[PDB]
């Protein structure tokens, strides 16, 4: 008899064969259904209850009965055809961990983590083919996230040698949940999980959590910040995450790939803040194509070519959109670019030639050269975010924003139509180092939360 | 043509296998200070020259 | 008691668009009510069919038109309720669009109302996060493109308002804004929608400009400032200066160093009344209400 053997295993809390994955434990499952097949669905549940050594907990019993149902009804040929069983079970499993002193929790948590990975993958897969399966968009991952969020809620800190199982998995849960949130179209909901994270954690310092979990967390948080255009906040996190990844001596492919994943966002973010990357160190995680690309962009920004930046963003539009990088760059790069453009002009015009005041017409022409043709100009066939935003004519405006952003020290006179700068030989007095200024104007939160 | 939504699945971190020499600099200290020959820059300078010459 | 089927709802809206927009300046409350009713009767039926899409779309358009028509007129109306209903119709429209998409279906006017959506919360970044997700053919649509341009152009790193996190490197391109507003390529409804930001745009433009002037710089002539902020006439700049305590010298110029305000929102005063742009008015006068409201594909 298989049923009773299992029920015994479970009762005692071994949980060796309590799994949905049919790679391992497939044979037992195959056997159970048939013994199970004869039995009525209603009959089996009492069966579970009537079994000896069974904890006096409604939830545990419900969970066991659920698993039996799964074993009885499961169709190996299709995970979809038996999704209901799977999800119902998983639900039951997870809400067996709510009660902090629930039966076998400690031996149950490890089961939950392993099954979670399985159910997420399944949910993900299913959602991707929702159109074909005639299922709602993100229907399953959503359900999962709800379940996990309830679990997340259930967690609270209250010898001092060993941490409870729930506490140990808390960070893992956070990252899982957040990843799901990003996977679903709406990642705003992360904010709730973040702010409630610390309150839920027993551990004194963030350092006490596993390094990989730390890195993923930082990655996600950074992405979250960037979603809200809070560039600096994102940058610190990215940089912290990549450093942490670097110092990790182990070089598995996963490691390097994740490193790349971070780099993808870090490279752009830094550029906005006026930070450039030494490629040598990043050579192992990035293809030459990537480097070259980001490089051409770097050139564009550095030498003050707006049209370049536009065309660059244009070429990489779709990919950039895929990461929510298009808009932020589109909006935030032009000023760094303008700074360099003006800085170049100023250095030659004033420091080299000792000209204190520059007429608007001059900057106008320079801006023409830098910006290229506008949608209003001849040979244009369309209005776009690449030919609509920037115009050569608005000299004063660009000067003004440059000044207000603290990237340029000057005074403009609308009536005179000329800008004025401090008569000096040192360029950095008139056009300070960009990163320091930007960061000064926009400081970040604490680098390590604990 | 296609009507599919845009999102990057690849962005999600791979699996955790885990179970302080962190002082590596990855940013160019002074991009700004460094000066190198470039066509665009020279073009700008050329324009500056033209403007200057044009108004005397 | 009972609920009107879709077709007669569409018929009602047809009546409204075909006959009643002419009476608008004064008949706003009535139309507001009717449109709301139409919108509700659809949800009461849990009906999201093409008729619902159509009706909400045209309703949104109408609201956009009403904003202008009302603002220009001296007639009393509540801005917040108009905006509110606008917002509601927009969100319902969005969700419907999404649903249709996830079911492998298409809406022909989605781009337009995606743009309108983009214009409603102009400084809210979530709308940017969202729009990047939509298909290429939607993202690259003239309307969404212009909307995006406006969103970029309008951004300011100095925008102060309770609960608003300032972000880095914002353009604050007032010039380009006003240039875009004057473009023949700008769809009129969009303009109507954008007009709602004139005051704040202008305020921050003026402040930003002021910050660049040297101590003891002479005040700026009216003509210049009128051009800079595309004011309709002297009365507007006078009123504007008065509102923000900008000293006016000789009745010709404004001494911008006197502009000393933490934020565009004044703590002990009610907001400066909404305004409009002459060009958009002139454009309106050269077309028909019906034409504007019906300016889309069929569902």
Sign of torsion, CA A408 A413 A416 A421? negative
Backbone break loci in chain C, preceding residues, C–N > 2.5 A: none
Q: What are phi and psi of A358, to 5 degrees?
A: -110, 125
Is the CB of B51 less than 8 angstroms away from the CB of A242?
no
> Would you tell me how many other CB atoms lie within 10 Å of the CB of residue C16?
19
Q: For chain C, say whether B1 makes contact (Cβ under 8 Å).
A: yes
> Tokens 């969202």, residue?
C130
User: Which are the contacts of A431, defined by CB distance < 8 A and separation ≥ 6?
Assistant: A339, A342, A343, A346, A347, A407, A408, A409
Is the CB of B41 less than 8 angstroms away from the CB of A303?
yes
Q: Do residues A85 and A93 touch, judged by C-beta distance below 8 A?
A: no
Return the closest-CA partner of residue C5 out of C56, C37, C45, C50.
C45
Q: Record the tokens describing residue B56, joined without a space.
A: 């005397």
β-partners of residue C221 are: C253
Q: Which domain holds residue B38?
A: 1-56
> Tokens 């779709």, residue?
A318
The DSSP code for A34 is H
Give the gap in angstroms from C-alpha C163 to the nearest C-alpha of chain A: 13
In angstroms, the CA C136 to CA C144 distance is: 11
In angstroms, the CA C280 to CA A293 distance is: 43
Q: Do residues C276 and C44 touch, judged by C-beta distance below 8 A?
A: no
* Structural domain spans, chain A: 1-450
User: Which are the contacts of A228, defined by CB distance < 8 A and separation ≥ 6?
Assistant: C125, C165, C167
Across the beta sheet with A410-413, the strand order is A357-359, A418-421, A410-413
Is the CB of B28 less than 8 angstroms away from the CB of A183?
no
Orientation angle between helical segments A83-94 and A105-128, nearest 10 degrees: 150
Where on the phi/psi map is residue A25: left (φ > 0), alpha (ψ -120 to 50), or beta?
Answer: left
CATH code, domain carrying C111: 1.25.40.990
Instruction: Collect all residues of chain A within an 8 Å Cβ-Cβ radius of residue B19.
Output: 210
Q: Do residues C213 and C246 touch, judged by C-beta distance below 8 A?
A: no
Q: How many domains does chain B have?
A: 1
Cα separation values, A342 from A143, A298, A407, C56, Å: 53, 17, 10, 48
The helix (H) or strand (E) run that includes residue C254 is strand C253-254
Give the nearest chain B residue to C134 (CA atoms): B5
> Would you tell me how many other CB atoms lie within 10 Å of the CB of residue A301?
25
> Tokens 């669905």, residue?
A41
Instruction: Collect all residues of chain C within an 8 Å Cβ-Cβ radius of residue A272.
Output: 168-169
Q: How many domains does chain C have?
A: 1
Instruction: Collect all residues of chain A within an 8 Å Cβ-Cβ radius of residue B22.
Output: 243-244, 246-247
Number of B/C CB contacts below 8 angstroms equals 19
Is the CB of A345 less than 8 angstroms away from the CB of B48?
yes
In angstroms, the CA A339 to CA B44 distance is: 14
Q: How is A251-285 classified by DSSP, letter by letter?
A: --HHHHHHHHHHHHHHHHHHHHTT--B-HHHHGGG
Sign of torsion, CA C278 C261 C74 C77? positive
Q: What 3-state class would DSSP assign to A418?
A: strand
Task: Kindly tell me the burial class for residue A163, based on how many C-beta atoms sit within 10 Å of its own C-beta (0-12, 13-18, 19 or more).
Answer: middle
Q: What are phi and psi of C265, to 5 degrees?
A: -90, 120
- Could you tell me the maximum CA-CA distance found in chain C, to the nearest angstrom? 72
Q: How is C180-242 classified by DSSP, letter by letter?
A: HHT-TTS-HHHHHHHGGGHHHHHHHHHHHHHHHSPTTPPPEEHHHHHHHTT-SSHHHHHHHHH
β-partners of residue A420 are: A357, A411
Q: For chain B, say whether A440 makes contact (Cβ under 8 Å).
A: no
In angstroms, the CA C173 to CA C196 distance is: 17
Q: Which domain holds residue C122?
A: 1-299
Solved with: X-ray
Interface of C with B in 113-132 (CB under 8 A): 132
Q: What 3-state class would DSSP assign to A307?
A: helix
């Amino acid at each position: 008899d298989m049923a009773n053997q299992l029920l015994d295993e479970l009762a005692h809390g071994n949980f060796s064969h309590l799994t949905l994955n049919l790679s391992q434990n497939g044979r037992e499952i195959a056997i159970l259904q048939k013994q199970l097949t004869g039995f009525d669905d209603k009959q089996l549940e009492t069966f579970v209850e009537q079994h000896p050594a069974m904890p006096n907990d409604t939830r545990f019993k419900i969970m066991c009965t659920s698993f039996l149902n799964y074993a009885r009804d499961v169709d190996p040929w299709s995970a979809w055809s038996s999704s209901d069983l799977i999800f119902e079970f998983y639900q039951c499993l997870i809400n067996c961990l709510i009660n902090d002193n629930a039966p076998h929790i400690e031996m149950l948590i490890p089961v939950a983590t392993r099954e979670t990975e399985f159910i997420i993958n399944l949910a993900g897969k299913l959602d991707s083919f929702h159109l074909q399966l005639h299922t709602r968009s993100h229907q399953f991952l959503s359900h999962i996230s709800s379940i996990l969020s309830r679990l997340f809620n259930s967690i609270k800190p209250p010898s001092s040698t060993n941490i409870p199982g729930k506490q140990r998995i808390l960070l893992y849960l956070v990252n899982k949940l957040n990843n799901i949130y990003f996977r679903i179209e709406s990642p705003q909901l992360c904010s709730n999980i973040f702010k409630n994270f610390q309150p839920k954690s027993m551990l004194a310092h963030f350092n006490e959590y596993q390094l990989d979990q730390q890195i993923e967390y930082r990655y996600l948080l950074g992405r979250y910040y960037l979603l809200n255009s809070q560039v600096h906040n994102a940058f610190v996190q990215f940089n912290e995450a990549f450093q942490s990844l670097l110092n990790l001596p182990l070089t598995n492919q996963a490691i390097t790939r994740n490193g790349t994943r971070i780099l993808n966002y870090m490279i752009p973010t830094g550029l906005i803040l006026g930070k450039m990357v030494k490629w040598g160190p990043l050579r192992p995680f990035l293809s030459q194509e990537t480097i070259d690309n980001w490089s051409v962009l770097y050139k564009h920004v550095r030498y003050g070519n707006i049209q370049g930046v536009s065309l660059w963003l244009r070429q990489n539009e779709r990919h950039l959109c895929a990461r929510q990088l298009l808009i932020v760059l589109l909006e935030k790069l032009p000023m760094v670019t303008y700074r360099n453009l003006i800085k170049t002009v100023i250095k030659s015009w004033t420091t080299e030639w000792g000209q204190n005041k520059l007429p608007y017409s001059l900057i106008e022409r320079v801006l023409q050269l830098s910006i290229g043709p506008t949608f209003e100009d001849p040979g244009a066939q369309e209005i776009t975010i690449y030919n609509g935003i920037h115009s050569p004519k608005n000299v004063e405006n660009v000067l003004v924003t440059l000044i207000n952003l603290g990237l340029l020290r000057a005074n403009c006179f609308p009536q005179l139509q000329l800008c004025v700068v401090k008569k000096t030989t040192m360029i950095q007095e008139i056009v300070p180092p960009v990163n320091e200024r930007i960061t000064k104007m926009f400081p970040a939160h604490s680098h390590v939360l604990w | 043509e296609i009507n599919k939504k845009s999102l990057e699945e690849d962005d999600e971190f791979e699996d955790f296998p885990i179970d302080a020499v962190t002082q590596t600099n990855i940013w160019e200290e002074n991009w700004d200070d460094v000066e190198v020959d470039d066509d665009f820059t020279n073009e700008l300078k050329a324009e500056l020259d033209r403007y200057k010459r044009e108004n005397q | 008691s009972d609920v009107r089927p879709p077709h007669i709802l569409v018929k009602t809206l047809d009546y409204i668009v075909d006959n009643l927009l002419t009476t608008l300046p004064e008949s706003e409350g009535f139309l507001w009510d009717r449109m709301r009713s139409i919108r509700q009767d659809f949800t009461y039926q849990n009906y999201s069919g093409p008729e619902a899409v159509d009706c909400n779309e045209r309703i949104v358009r109408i609201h956009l038109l009403i904003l202008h028509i009302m603002v220009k007129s001296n007639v009393e109306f509540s801005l917040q309720q108009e905006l509110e209903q606008l917002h509601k119709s927009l969100i319902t429209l969005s969700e419907i669009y999404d649903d249709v998409r996830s079911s492998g279906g298409t809406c022909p006017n989605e781009a337009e109302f995606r743009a309108y959506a983009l214009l409603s919360k102009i400084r809210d970044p979530q709308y940017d996060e969202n729009i990047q997700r939509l298909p290429k053919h939607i993202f690259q649509d003239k309307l969404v493109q212009m909307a995006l341009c406006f969103r970029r152009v309008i951004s300011n790193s100095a925008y102060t308002e309770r609960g608003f996190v300032k972000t880095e490197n914002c353009l604050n391109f007032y010039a380009r804004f006003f240039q875009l507003m004057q473009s023949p390529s700008l769809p009129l409804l969009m303009g109507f929608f954008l007009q709602m930001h004139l005051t704040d745009i202008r305020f921050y433009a003026l402040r930003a400009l002021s910050h660049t002037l040297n101590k003891k710089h002479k005040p700026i002539p009216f003509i210049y400032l009128e051009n800079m902020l595309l004011f309709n006439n002297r009365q507007e700049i006078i009123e504007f200066c008065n509102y923000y305590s900008i000293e006016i010298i000789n009745g010709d110029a404004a001494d911008l160093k006197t502009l000393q305000h933490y934020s565009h929102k004044l703590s002990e005063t009610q907001p400066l009344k909404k305004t409009y742009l002459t060009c958009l008015e002139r454009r309106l006068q050269k077309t028909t209400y019906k034409g504007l409201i019906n300016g889309g594909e069929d569902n």
